[PDB]
Design a protein around this ligand. Structure first.
Ligand SMILES: OC[C@@H](COCc1ccccc1)Nc1ncnc2[nH]ccc12
Ligand SMILES: [Cl-]
Length: 167
């Protein structure tokens, strides 16, 4: 039993809700919140910009030190950093950005990072400003993640389409 509330159950381990991941994280304070990161951990917009804003830019300051030490992430890769005031940890995961010409096949690799954590609050990877089809992202999530994932879909209209079209 966990403290996630109001989610629709899609499979044994995947759940979904129309919610703002920032507000969800503040309420639940989950062990792991997933950020929709880029390889430079530059949290400018989308989920990343919103999560960073909620940390009063502390996520960005920590991220800049991470990059200065380690260099950029790989597309499909991840790193674990602090969750600041939002969660214990933030798993920064880089899905492919179609608006940069990146290989959508890397979306499965991106979701594989979730399997290193027993329970996660997460957005749909490569959705939103990353330009991939969210119906596809949800399908890859369900077919790749085996740990317990609670998906927050910010847009109410898109949420209804994902549910009604879910196979
Ligand atoms: O795939 C993740 C994207 C999808 O939403 C954007 C969108 C706009 C119009 C139509 C479809 C989709 N972003 C988020 N998801 C959850 N919580 C969030 N908080 C702030 C951003 C954000
Ligand atoms: Cl977005």
């Amino acid at each position: 039993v966990n403290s996630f509330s109001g989610y629709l159950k899609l499979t044994d381990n995947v759940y979904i809700k129309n919610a703002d991941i920032v507000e969800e994280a503040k309420k639940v304070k989950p062990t792991v919140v997933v950020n929709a990161a880029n390889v430079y951990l530059k949290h400018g917009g989308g989920v990343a910009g919103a999560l960073n804003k909620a940390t009063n830019n502390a996520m960005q300051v920590e991220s800049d030190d991470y990059i200065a030490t380690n260099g950029p992430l790989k597309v499909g890769g991840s790193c674990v950093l602090s969750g600041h005031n939002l969660a214990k940890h933030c798993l920064h995961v880089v899905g492919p950005n179609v608006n940069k010409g990146e290989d959508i096949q890397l979306l499965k690799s991106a979701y594989e990072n979730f399997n290193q954590h027993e329970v996660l609050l997460a957005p749909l990877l490569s959705a939103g400003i990353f330009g991939a089809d969210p119906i596809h992202s949800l399908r890859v999530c369900v077919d790749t993640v085996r740990t317990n994932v609670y998906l927050a879909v910010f847009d109410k209209n898109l949420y209804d389409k994902l549910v009604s079209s879910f196979l």
